Design a protein around this motif. Sequence first.
Motif, short mmCIF file in Angstrom:
data_model
loop_
_atom_site.label_atom_id
_atom_site.label_comp_id
_atom_site.label_asym_id
_atom_site.label_seq_id
_atom_site.Cartn_x
_atom_site.Cartn_y
_atom_site.Cartn_z
N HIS C 8 0.72 -1.00 0.00
CA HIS C 8 0.03 0.26 0.06
C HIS C 8 0.77 1.29 0.03
CE1 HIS C 8 -2.89 -3.14 1.40
NE2 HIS C 8 -3.73 -2.42 0.80
N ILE C 11 -0.63 4.14 -2.50
CA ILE C 11 -1.92 4.89 -2.18
C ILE C 11 -1.07 6.17 -1.70
CG2 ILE C 11 -3.93 5.06 -0.88
CD1 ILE C 11 -3.39 2.77 -3.14
N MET C 29 -4.90 5.97 -7.11
CA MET C 29 -5.98 5.47 -6.81
C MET C 29 -7.03 5.51 -7.94
SD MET C 29 -7.64 3.64 -4.53
CE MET C 29 -6.68 3.74 -2.92
N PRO C 62 -13.18 -10.06 -0.04
CA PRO C 62 -11.49 -9.87 0.29
C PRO C 62 -10.68 -9.56 -0.87
CG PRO C 62 -12.59 -12.35 0.47
CD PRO C 62 -13.29 -11.71 -0.56
N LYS C 66 -9.97 -2.64 0.59
CA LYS C 66 -10.82 -2.23 1.81
C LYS C 66 -9.81 -1.56 2.55
CE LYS C 66 -12.41 -6.06 2.82
NZ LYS C 66 -11.96 -6.61 1.38
N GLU C 278 -10.41 -6.71 10.77
CA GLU C 278 -10.80 -7.97 11.31
C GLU C 278 -11.73 -7.74 12.46
OE1 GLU C 278 -10.54 -9.73 9.11
OE2 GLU C 278 -8.96 -8.79 7.87
N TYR C 340 -13.56 -5.62 -9.23
CA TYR C 340 -13.11 -4.74 -10.23
C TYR C 340 -13.60 -5.23 -11.86
CZ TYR C 340 -10.45 -2.55 -6.30
OH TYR C 340 -10.17 -2.10 -5.23
N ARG C 378 -4.31 -10.45 -6.39
CA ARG C 378 -3.09 -10.26 -5.73
C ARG C 378 -1.86 -11.14 -6.21
NH1 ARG C 378 -5.58 -10.01 0.52
NH2 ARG C 378 -5.53 -7.86 0.65
N1 ADP Z 1 -8.66 -0.12 -6.46
C1 ADP Z 1 -7.80 -0.13 -5.94
N2 ADP Z 1 -6.57 0.63 -6.16
C2 ADP Z 1 -5.20 0.66 -5.99
N3 ADP Z 1 -4.92 -0.38 -5.26
C3 ADP Z 1 -5.75 -1.57 -4.80
C4 ADP Z 1 -7.32 -1.35 -5.40
N4 ADP Z 1 -7.98 -2.52 -4.74
C5 ADP Z 1 -6.92 -3.15 -4.11
N5 ADP Z 1 -5.73 -2.47 -4.19
C6 ADP Z 1 -4.42 -3.10 -3.66
O1 ADP Z 1 -4.95 -4.63 -3.08
C7 ADP Z 1 -5.00 -4.57 -1.83
C8 ADP Z 1 -6.28 -5.12 -1.30
O2 ADP Z 1 -6.43 -5.85 -0.19
P1 ADP Z 1 -7.45 -5.45 0.79
O3 ADP Z 1 -8.77 -6.13 0.37
O4 ADP Z 1 -7.43 -3.95 1.30
O5 ADP Z 1 -7.11 -6.45 2.26
P2 ADP Z 1 -8.44 -6.73 3.49
O6 ADP Z 1 -9.51 -7.69 2.55
O7 ADP Z 1 -7.64 -7.55 4.39
O8 ADP Z 1 -9.00 -5.52 3.57
C9 ADP Z 1 -4.72 -3.19 -1.02
O9 ADP Z 1 -3.74 -3.23 -0.06
C10 ADP Z 1 -4.22 -2.33 -2.27
O10 ADP Z 1 -2.93 -2.13 -2.31
#
Ligand code: ADP
Lengths: 53, 82, 431, 125, 65, 437
Positions: C8, C11, C29, C62, C66, C278, C340, C378
């Motif tokens: 992250h 971001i 983003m 997941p 988020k 969580e 997405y 991922r």
């Molecule tokens: N729309 C997006 N734009 C940029 N990065 C994203 C986006 N969606 C997911 N990611 C990346 O993928 C990861 C998604 O993990 P996340 O769903 O936040 O974990 P959790 O399910 O524990 O909340 C984020 O840490 C981010 O770095």
Amino acid sequence: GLGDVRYRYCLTTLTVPQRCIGFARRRVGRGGRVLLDRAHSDYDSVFHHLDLE
Amino acid sequence: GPIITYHSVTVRCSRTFITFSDDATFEEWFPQGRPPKVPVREVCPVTHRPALYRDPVTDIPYATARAFKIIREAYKKYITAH
Amino acid sequence: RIERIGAHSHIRGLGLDDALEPRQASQGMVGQLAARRAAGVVLEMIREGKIAGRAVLIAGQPGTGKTAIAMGMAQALGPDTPFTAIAGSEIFSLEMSKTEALTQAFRRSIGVRIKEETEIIEGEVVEIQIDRPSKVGKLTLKTTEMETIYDLGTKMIESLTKDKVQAGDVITIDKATGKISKLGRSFTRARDYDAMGSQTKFVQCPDGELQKRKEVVHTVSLHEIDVINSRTQGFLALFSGDTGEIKSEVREQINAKVAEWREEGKAEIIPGVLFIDEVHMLDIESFSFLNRALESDMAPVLIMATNRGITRIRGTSYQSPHGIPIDLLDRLLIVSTTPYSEKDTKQILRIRCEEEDVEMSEDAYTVLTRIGLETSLRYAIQLITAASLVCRKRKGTEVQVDDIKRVYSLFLDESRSTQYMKEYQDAFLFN
Amino acid sequence: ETEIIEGEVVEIQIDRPSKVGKLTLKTTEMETIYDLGTKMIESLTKDKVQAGDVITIDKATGKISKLGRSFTRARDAMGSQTKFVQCPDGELQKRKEVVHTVSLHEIDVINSRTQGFLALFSGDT
Amino acid sequence: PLLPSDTGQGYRTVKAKLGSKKVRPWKWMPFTNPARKDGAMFFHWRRAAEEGKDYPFARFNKTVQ
Amino acid sequence: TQRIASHSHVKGLGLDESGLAKQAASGLVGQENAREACGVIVELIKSKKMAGRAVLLAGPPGTGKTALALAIAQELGSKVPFCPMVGSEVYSTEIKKTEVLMENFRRAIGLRIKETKEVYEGEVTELTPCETENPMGGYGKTISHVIIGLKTAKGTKQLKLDPSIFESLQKERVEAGDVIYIEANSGAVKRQGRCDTYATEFDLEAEEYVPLPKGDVHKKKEIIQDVTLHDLDVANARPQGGQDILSMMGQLMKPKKTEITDKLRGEINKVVNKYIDQGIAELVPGVLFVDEVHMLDIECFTYLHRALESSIAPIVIFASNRGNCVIRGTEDITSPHGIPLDLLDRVMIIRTMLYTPQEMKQIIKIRAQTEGINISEEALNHLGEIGTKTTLRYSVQLLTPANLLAKINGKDSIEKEHVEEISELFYDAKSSAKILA
Ligand SMILES: Nc1ncnc2c1ncn2[C@@H]1O[C@H](COP(=O)(O)OP(=O)(O)O)[C@@H](O)[C@H]1O
Ligand SMILES: Nc1ncnc2c1ncn2[C@@H]1O[C@H](COP(=O)(O)OP(=O)(O)O)[C@@H](O)[C@H]1O
């Protein structure tokens, strides 16, 4: 390369006043006394480089 | 009392100095005198090399207990003679 | 530098215009435009800071950002506002009750800013003389405008002689405290002697009048105040975190004193923000305790995250939406995240490639995007840097789709791993 | 190896300030005298050592390992609670090689904290 | 480019070691060289006790043939 | 040197320069794809760009993965730290689970502190002032500055000393015939002890004379050391102050471990960033290995999500030989290796396969070399059969007892009969089960 059998000199330092002594060789003297003869060569004035620059 | 001058003259440049109260203050304050005078070596006479142990009276560095006995013999003999 | 490229790190905010319309790309983003709208509203209301106790939850698939949404929020918030993120499993501790832990987190989130006037002087050490016998002392200073000369206090004498400051230096002393601080040496000060001593840089002579009054402001959290005044030399426990069962009478006494300091312009409070991840990891006890934890005025906004659906309430046998009892559920609102789309995935992966600083082929982009879509985002994120390393081993620069297939074969994925485990079920025990 | 000194001090002169102790550590055979450091003087005083006593002196540490008194009383004999010893012999300085055995547990506990030994004795580490 | 020579004194620190060690005497004793067939009688500063020892230095009687 | 260990034989991954795997190298066979994957991982570590990535190894019983991780570390060398871990360690009675996890992550990041220093040493030869009446007014009994004659074994000299330092050296027991630690740029000075030369003639010398310093005065060179920032946290969190009343108070109580607050961690981060940006220090991030991850609970997996997400988490690896079992803590939830699906999603994976009997022959040969025990071929084939029916470790253990039996016989090499009596003596999984049955 000059080829002088007896004029083989070498560097070293001393025990108590340790320091670069310069090209020197031991040699016996009268009364059975050894004497260190320190030479004087192309690098006579610069006898402190160390680490083989 | 002990009159001391910590007057730090910053003069451009920095400077400081100390003026002691008097010669007495200077001497007690800066007495020094005489160098350490490392001692001289000593060795055991009879065995002719140094001994950790040394006569309690004459301080001769005697090595062996038998060295002690014989040196005591020589001692008392010397005094008996003179 | 201690940081490192993180999942992250890309971001940097939320990418919302002034009207809060999300931008299709901004400060790293894009996506979930409805979620971006809602988050912008939340951030606006936090800035308003006129209300307390509000709570909100984020649910969705997941691995759908988020946590990324939350981190963009925290970044955009700014350092002034206090913030804190914790995990549900972390409250469970063998030193304290859970309720005490929740109170500690709450009080940590909120912050207090203290303002107070100052009274100080500063200038060159123009000259000093000390007169050990008590000690009589005389001294002078100056600045870029004028100069002055003053006597020397006996406790001032001890202070300075322990400081061992050198004449010509530049320093600042506070009358009330009588504590000095060196602010960098000056031309004459560090001109020093012929004797070596040391070498150092210089600072410009101070300016304005010696005396300056001036005002200083500080900031501290409620939990910090609680701990510091709790045990009377519980101060060192702040780092050790050995604080236990901070009594309630202390809480109420601090609340009263802070309120009265507040309405008298002495200090200004600030409503912090607290995020728990969580949240489903909480039992029913914590749900009960926090359910009322929102009425107390000192209530930072809460943000929760969980993807579950109709799951057993932790500590019991009751299925509930996301495993949170309805009592809380009716006390907060929700935001949903959708999986997405296609092209957006291309944008996201290009952004991550920019992050990694590894620029490669277009066919690679197409193939990798389709593979990630089929399997997961991922796994694609994992494959990015792996392919980079493989291509650098090739000694070229542009990664090629053949290299991508090589690396993909090298590192089986979840579906491939389960397919394998199927290939020989008896490989691993307890199936 | 230890290489420590011992013997029987015939007497000591109080080092009136002058660290010259009458180190008359007369073994059955031999005797000598030496200096006596201020630390040594305070050690002798605090231990309340007595002249004509048998004591052993750590070489490097100089710790006055108390051992009682000398045979001058008993093979006069002064009977009390304190232990009694006769005079050792010959070389005041002597060597003594020693061995020890310890599981890793002993080292762990001893170096664990200030007083791990009593933790072992109480077994409460 | 000089040469230091052996020094035994260094400092006044050697009070002892002499009273137990007599200085073996030296005498300007006569002698004869075997390498001189006529055996001319000459002199050496021998340490007294080293009397009568054959001329140690005349063992180099190597010649052409 | 060391009694042979279960993996002493291994010495290196032995991947060709191109990254490909030599069939056998420093004690390895098969799993060529696994070896190349480990090569990629060590490449990633040496890259140092990435952060927080982690892998999991899936392999049947008879771990082996132990060897793979060990070889990874060996190739990594000692330039970078590395720490092992066992799932049971998480179950502690002094600190919470997440505390142990965060602590172990913290201990995995190393550092290297480079700090230069300078001092002047020697034995105090003399001491004199630079008297001058120039100062304004007053009897001019003033010292411009002090002159100190210092001698090292290298030689002797003196330096210019400001007036203020004479008061300092008064503070210390400065006297003719002792050595001192004169910080050039700072002015720190101390009194080690009188020159050993005097003690040389001393017949009794209770004091502990310091020797004569050697070499130039003008040197203290650059100091260097490394630590794990966890040790830094331990040192800084609880101030030491062993003399203070509080120190006596601590030694009254039994020392323990306290859940270190996170603010201390953030502050450590800030200060280390300040030192590093000045170039004083150097960070050498390590990697971590946690075996039997299946032994953990759900709490730790969920917290590991957060720990992994961090941009400071060092690389870490895991291993498990457990099928799709019920996740501990979870009453029913079942997943491969007892790892939640979500945690599985954000991690890499590698797999190991079964081993063919020829590979067994190769490995057994390697092990016999390692022990330095000669083997007759009939023994090789017999033990190959045994491992065929039995597992690999069962066959491996039989080596030393059989070698010893042979030594009793006076022989040197082990033969078929030796392994026969060894086999009848001890039972395998199936034979032991049957005899149990
Ligand atoms: N729309 C997006 N734009 C940029 N990065 C994203 C986006 N969606 C997911 N990611 C990346 O993928 C990861 C998604 O993990 P996340 O769903 O936040 O974990 P959790 O399910 O524990 O909340 C984020 O840490 C981010 O770095
Ligand atoms: N579970 C396994 N999966 C794959 N290979 C293995 C396994 N166990 C052992 N090996 C192989 O056996 C050799 C030695 O490993 P070993 O020391 O027996 O590990 P362990 O004792 O943990 O089984 C290695 O070369 C490795 O290739």
